[PDB]
């Protein structure tokens, strides 16, 4: 994370140099501006493709193995050292075997590269950059130039609906009796001490043979059968039409919340797709969007909803949480809606929403700094490390004085409980 | 060192998968392990976990993955039969019903020990049968003579081509013309 125009300062740490190498301009034109302006995270895959480093590993507790490997080594002659180190590198850190392009962690996965170079490549200001961006947000969903990509789903808290119920259930009081046997039986059960069951056997003659039976067995059969029929009533009734008010919040930097009155008929999958079709109808998107529904819990957790039988359980378990001043005809539910696909316009909206969200002075400054390190852009004109640290220092030193950084931006990134304790 | 990389859960999973169909288990390794090819057991475990994280329960996920495998196999052997047909009417390929004629020959040769002369004679009269041989052959029971239906031949294969008309032109459908 090379950020800090978000805390109102220019980036430091010399990585500026790496971003300005003529190599990076070749492979990912525009990426340098993307990461320096927008505070944005690069990952292993991105650092490998840019050729910032040669080495990568998936092995647990690598450090121990390095230790024990260099314990078994013997001499100090640089022939020996060269081979030992080299063999270590080849067998683990270079990916010769058991590695794929799907598996390496990458933010800039190739559609994203195309987008970045459309937005940020070769633009002579921050201002040009955002009237460009503004013009990209405006594209329809049907244009050729609005291109989609796989979006990485931000993970839910609970991960399953059952987990949702259980998690919700610790803030509640269990009943001593399950819903189907609470209601008194239509027959009448005289309560005895426990012991008087065991003395209730009896001897009857069935056909030609002697038989020991319970005297009360049939009575208990009527009882258990009745309880089963009440269970059936209960379940069939959870499937009955549920007229609730639906809130759906689209996950993303663009706040939009859709509200509509929906009737859930959970007896004859198709119902989830009905609800999703409706949601998309209101959001103004084609009905072919791949949409992940999710349950927003009163505990501030989140679930995926994969199935209708689960959705029924969500309706039954959450009574709704409502401000009564605002009058709703039906109990609300709160869904979050994740998009399995980002469009170009969408992504651009996000990135502009961040550029507006960080200190303008440090945005413009950091742009100046990148283009000062970059220089001409030829392999020679790029500053070496020694000059880059010095330059970043020059800008940092000049910005830090301003009230913007120290008085405001420094406390920006605090946690929530920190702000609570301070308040 | 020998310690299973497979955790007990995995063990139970691919064991259940393996016991519900032997085809899936054997596919990769029938004889020796072919280890540079992917294996159905593995691919199926992969898409099983895939199903589980989309919220499909145990039973239905298993039977669904298995259905995937079986349907793929269905495709494959449909293709095999579609080409099998072509190959049989090409004339040089053989299913069991003709193979019984080959075995027939080898067995007749062994049972009654034959001189190479007798063999060549067999060949030429079986060539006569094979080509000129006729359906509907008659035996004399006398007065009364009965006709029955024989084995295959080439002349039969002609008469089948003319719609048993005995004529080369039965097709009224449009075709090219020559003058």
């Amino acid at each position: 994370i090379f950020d800090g125009p978000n805390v109102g300062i220019t980036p430091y740490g010399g990585m500026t140099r790496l971003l300005a190498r003529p190599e990076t301009s070749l492979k990912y034109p525009g990426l340098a501006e993307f990461v320096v302006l927008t505070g944005a995270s690069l990952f292993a895959g991105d650092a490998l493709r840019l050729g910032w480093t040669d080495l990568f590993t998936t092995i647990p507790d690598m450090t121990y193995h390095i230790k024990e490997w260099f314990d078994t080594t013997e001499h100090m002659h640089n022939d020996a050292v060269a081979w030992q180190l080299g063999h270590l590198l080849e067998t683990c850190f270079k990916m010769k075997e058991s590695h794929s392009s799907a598996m390496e962690r990458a933010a800039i996965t190739p559609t994203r590269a195309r987008w970045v170079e459309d937005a940020f490549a070769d633009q002579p200001s921050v201002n040009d950059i955002m009237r460009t961006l503004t013009e990209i947000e405006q594209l329809p969903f049907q244009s050729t130039h609005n291109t989609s990509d796989e979006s990485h789903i931000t993970p839910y808290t609970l991960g399953s609906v059952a987990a949702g119920v259980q998690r919700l259930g610790e803030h509640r009081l269990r009943y001593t009796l399950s819903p189907w046997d609470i209601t008194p039986p239509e027959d009448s059960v005289v309560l005895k001490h426990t012991s008087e069951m065991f003395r209730a056997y009896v001897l009857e003659r069935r056909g030609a043979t002697d038989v020991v039976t319970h005297r009360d067995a049939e009575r208990a059969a009527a009882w258990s059968q009745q309880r089963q029929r009440e269970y059936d009533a209960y379940c069939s009734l959870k499937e009955a039409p549920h007229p609730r008010h639906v809130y759906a919040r689209l996950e993303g930097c663009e706040g939009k919340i859709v509200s509509f009155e929906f009737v859930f008929e959970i007896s004859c999958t198709t119902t989830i797709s009905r609800l999703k079709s409706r949601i998309l109808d209101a959001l103004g998107m084609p009905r072919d969007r791949n949409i992940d529904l999710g349950w927003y819990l009163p505990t501030l957790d989140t679930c995926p909803i994969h199935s209708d039988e689960e959705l029924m359980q969500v309706l039954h378990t959450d009574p709704g949480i409502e401000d009564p001043k605002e009058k709703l005809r039906y109990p609300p539910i709160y869904f979050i809606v994740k998009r399995c696909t980002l469009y170009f316009s969408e992504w651009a909206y996000a990135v502009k929403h961040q550029l507006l969200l960080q200190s303008p002075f440090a945005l413009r400054a950091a742009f100046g700094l990148l283009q000062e390190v970059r220089g001409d852009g030829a392999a020679e004109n790029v500053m070496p490390l020694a000059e880059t640290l010095g330059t970043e220092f020059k800008y940092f030193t000049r910005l830090m004085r301003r009230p913007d950084f120290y008085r405001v931006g420094v406390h920006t990134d605090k946690s929530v409980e920190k702000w609570e304790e301070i308040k | 060192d020998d310690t299973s990389t497979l955790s007990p859960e995995r063990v139970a999973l691919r064991d259940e998968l393996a016991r519900k169909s032997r085809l899936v288990a054997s596919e990769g390794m029938r004889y020796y392990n072919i280890f540079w090819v992917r294996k159905p057991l593995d691919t199926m475990e992969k898409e099983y976990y895939e199903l589980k994280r989309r919220g499909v329960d145990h039973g239905e996920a298993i039977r669904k993955v298995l259905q995937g495998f079986y349907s793929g196999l269905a495709v494959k052997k449909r293709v095999a039969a579609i080409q099998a047909e072509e190959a049989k009417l090409t004339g040089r390929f053989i299913t069991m019903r003709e193979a019984t004629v080959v075995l027939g020959v080898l067995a007749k040769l062994h049972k009654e020990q034959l001189t190479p002369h007798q063999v060549s004679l067999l060949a030429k009269e079986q060539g006569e049968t094979t080509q000129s041989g006729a359906k509907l052959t008659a035996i004399v029971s006398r007065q009364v003579e009965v006709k029955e239906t024989a084995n295959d031949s080439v002349r039969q294969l002609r008469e089948k081509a003319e719609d048993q008309t005995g004529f080369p032109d039965w097709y009224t459908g449009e075709s090219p013309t020559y003058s």
Partner: peptide, 29 residues
């Protein structure tokens, strides 16, 4: 056991996964 071997596992920490949410999603128990 109060003494442990190199290639042998040492004692399990008792619980009495929810808390691995930050980790590899596939990482099991």
């Amino acid at each position: 056991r109060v003494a442990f071997d190199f290639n042998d596992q040492l004692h399990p920490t008792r619980i009495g996964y929810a808390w691995f949410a930050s980790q590899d999603p596939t990482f099991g128990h």
